[PDB]
Write a protein that binds this ligand. Structure first.
Ligand code: A1A17
Ligand code: CL
Length: 165
């Protein structure tokens, strides 16, 4: 199971790690992808997870969108975890660079509550443009199930821990 995490709260844990390497090591029931509404896994967490599946995640995702249309900002879908996990929960946080409402970040994290245990990144961080410190606060104040956060930036990880209030 999960190793080397700092406990932030009763249910939130955090580690300086690449979510792809964590997933390959642990093979959790659920890995969260930081998706966009089109499930176009081009870069960041999504591009890295998809690359590790040899593009099978993208092929599955394109079939999903062709059938169902895009997700909502704040929404999610459950797809296969391929070689990385049983399932992948694709969750769309708001992209501040697109003018999307940061309040939708709480809605995005609510999707985690449908799953008992998840390996996840901080939503809306990275190329989605939001402050990771704010994202962690929303996570802790929204998710009630057990979440293991992989932060792939050592300086950021240290700042998140040292400023956690
Ligand atoms: C740095 C931060 C917040 O953790 C997010 C935003 C940018 C990329 N990132 C990642 N997180 C975890 N595992 C990852 N693997 C590849 C990328 C990646
Ligand atoms: Cl990202």
């Amino acid at each position: 199971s999960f190793s080397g995490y700092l406990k932030l709260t009763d249910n939130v844990y955090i580690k300086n790690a690449d979510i792809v390497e964590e997933a390959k090591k642990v093979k959790p029931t659920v890995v969260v992808n930081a998706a966009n509404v089109y499930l176009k896994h081009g870069g960041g967490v999504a591009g890295a997870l998809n690359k590790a599946t040899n593009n099978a995640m993208q092929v599955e995702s394109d079939d999903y969108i062709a059938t169902n249309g895009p997700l909502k900002v704040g929404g999610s879908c459950v797809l296969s975890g391929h070689n990385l996990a049983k399932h992948c929960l694709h969750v769309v946080g708001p992209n501040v660079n697109k003018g999307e409402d940061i309040q939708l970040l709480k809605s995005a994290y609510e999707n985690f509550n449908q799953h008992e245990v998840l390996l996840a990144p901080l939503l809306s961080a990275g190329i989605f443009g939001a402050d990771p410190i704010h994202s962690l606060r929303v996570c802790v104040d929204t998710v009630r199930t057990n979440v293991y956060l992989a932060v792939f930036d050592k300086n950021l990880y240290d700042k998140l821990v040292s400023s956690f209030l």
